[model samples]
Target: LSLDQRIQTLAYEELNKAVEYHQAKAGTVVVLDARTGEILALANTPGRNRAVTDMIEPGSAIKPFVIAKALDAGKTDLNERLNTQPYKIGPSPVRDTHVYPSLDVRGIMQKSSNVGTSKLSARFGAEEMYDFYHELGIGVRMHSGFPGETAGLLRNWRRWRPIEQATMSFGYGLQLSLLQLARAYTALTHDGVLLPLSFEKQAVAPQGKRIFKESTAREVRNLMVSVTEPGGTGTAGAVDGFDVGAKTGTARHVATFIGFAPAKNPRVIVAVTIDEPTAHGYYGGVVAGPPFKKIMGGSLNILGISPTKPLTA
Candidate 1:
């Protein structure tokens, strides 16, 4: 789909401002329209990941993969609870990222609970989990091979230990450049077909392959929406009058926010993964959520994709 043919000159200025702002803060940024894989914006800081330009370990942003895997395995209900109380996985603390008792899938995702996600992965099991990752485009090398482009480590499933598998559940061990990680998630939000990501040449998004099934995707997005609800951790990611669905994640060393917009009619899928956000209170929904919201809102506004409703009173 082409950009609206009637955008005014000032609107271009605002968009450019957005680009400059993101470049100032993020080093580099790229925005893509999920419908046609059209990159809406790409800005690069001197040394930051180039966005279709380069790669970095996407960190905990990969949680969407777990979300997709769960959905594909017929684990769609948000009320689906995993044993979230911390347990020992062979000698290591499979700590439930939260002290909260009795977490449902929605709670686990909203809280970015490590312990909670660990349990989710355990129940999902290793064999099935690896299949989902492969299908989701995790193990393959997404090589544009730009200079300094890092091909993150995606080892064979045969070598993963129970702990390794558990870690992978919440984004560890395997690595993907942020852009690759973000695009792989197109499968999660886009009806379960992983598209080939590119820096040049736009292609029509093909019919979605039935990996997770429609109802599964619908259920997952519903729960993801709850994450951005008034009391959810992802509440910061919410726009005033739009239905937003998202997941927040932070690993031992990184923070990330990834999700889609206007649940009823999605026009964008954005993922923001910030590195080494170890300062106080650095959660994905809180730290990166606002930026994600700003970009999404600004993008839609400029594209003339009408607001869903006037601001709620």
Candidate 2:
């Protein structure tokens, strides 16, 4: 069983405690086996799991796929310069929380700049972006058959306007169930192949569908690492003795953090989402990152995954 009693209890307590302590409206936490795609624990606040049922905009948590798509198309390189200056798209202006005159492709994601990502989206047509996200299982029901799960929403590219496409590039126009957001990262975690999430323990390892070049996926994974590094948006998600990489998002009352452990060789993926936080920390890095770090670090210990690297200053 992937969900050990100890781990499940701990995950359950950590999630509920955080949501209650922060006085958030609701929250969900998912712990999954990275190598096998087995769900370890799926917990939610107020005693009902919303990990699969609630549809919400993923915000900057979705940026990793944008970077992946750009890299696969060879439309941009790692250090490619993007104008991060505040700009307008029709009446809606695109901007970042902080100004960056120019940032590399990696920095764009590191900072979660709507302007930078909208600028990067200029590389592809709306149709291309839609197809990429669709293949990654956005707007698609999972094979798990969890009842009442929404496919979320992804409009057809042909139907998208310029601003819609630009906003979608930074993750606002589309929505996804929290579990779908977590599962989408399987492509990055599993070397470009999207693994089918399994509720039942695996008898034999399932083959994953390849969605990207292994090299491209690796590049995106490394880029995501920057999000948790010093000065990156998700610095709070780090854990002692483990190299973690993560992304944080706070938009429209939703705070989310999703990431994997041991950067060089990931073993588990943890995703935490808090909906409608009205008190305490409202930002994803502020609200969700700490619990994510707790669950992830505890999962590593419970699962007996040894830390191959030492914590660095």
Candidate 3:
């Protein structure tokens, strides 16, 4: 089997711990070889492989993709600043957890500001947004041969209202399986290449499709790094001794953290999702971040990837 025994064991342990710790209904952890798109670990609580079967609204975890798409389309630049105040989209207000008078692209990603994301998304036409997402593999089954895998849901852009477009910008109004989310992240980890995920061992890496310019992917990866830094929403997801580039998502009862390690040249991507977390917290950074940290850190150690961050006192 292509699955690494060590990584699989580590993933299950962490997934179980997070589920029990948060008293969550269920959870999944998917680890992929960043360069080759091999599935190193796929663990799901309750033993149903929900990683491929279940779909949920991704919330803010979807921002990186939106931002990356905008950047790639040349619709927005990293230096451009945007107002992040609560704003109306077709009579409904779109707000952030906290209002910032202004934020650049990097700041928008770091804060996971819904308002900023929605505003930036305005740069794209409805067809452009849908096409970008469709290319990213949303609303499609991975065809990794995983039984009962879902196609998820992504309504046609032609049917989207202004509010739906805004909500979709920050990861609502649509759904994706955890595995699909992991697969989508390969574009970031693999420097703009979107790879087809595999369960069987491969002698050589497949040449994946280019979804974004290499520069665009690198810039977005750097922006994601900010999300785990001191003031970012996913600080708890940071792994000690390694640079982590990750994003957190919280939609009602679901919590998610999707990211990669050794940020400069990612070796592995770890995606975590906890459903219906009922205990200490329901926020993605709170409930899913710790497991992500532990699982990613352990996987890196097991893979013998050296730490990129320096030790602190």
Candidate 1 — which residues are off by over 4 angstroms? 1-28, 48-59, 143-147, 199-203, 207-210, 277-281
What lDDT tens digits, residue by residue, belong to model 3 across residues 159-228? 9999999999999998989989999999998889999989887676787899999999999999999999
lDDT of each: 0.62, 0.84, 0.90
Strongest candidate by TM-score? 3
Please give the TM-score that candidate 2 achieves against the real structure: 0.96
TM-score comparison, 1 vs 3, better candidate: 3
User: Using lDDT as the measure, what is the rank order of every candidate, best first?
Assistant: 3, 2, 1
Candidate 1, 1-313: lDDT as tens digits: 3333232232234333433433323423345566555445544434644554444455446665676566567654565776667677788766654577767777776666667666667766677778766666665666654565655566677888998888887777776666666667566566655666655546677544546666666666776787788757788778766888777776554456667777755667766655545344566665667667776676677766776878874
Deviation in angstroms for 107 in model 1? Answer: 2.0
| Pairs of colliding residues, candidate 3 | none
Model 2 CA deviation exceeding 4 Å by range: 311-313
Q: Flag the better candidate by lDDT, 2 or 3.
A: 3
Distance from true position, residue 110, model 1, in Å?
A: 2.2
Q: Indicate the worst ten consecutive residues by lDDT in candidate 3.
A: 304-313
Better of 2 and 3 by TM-score: 3
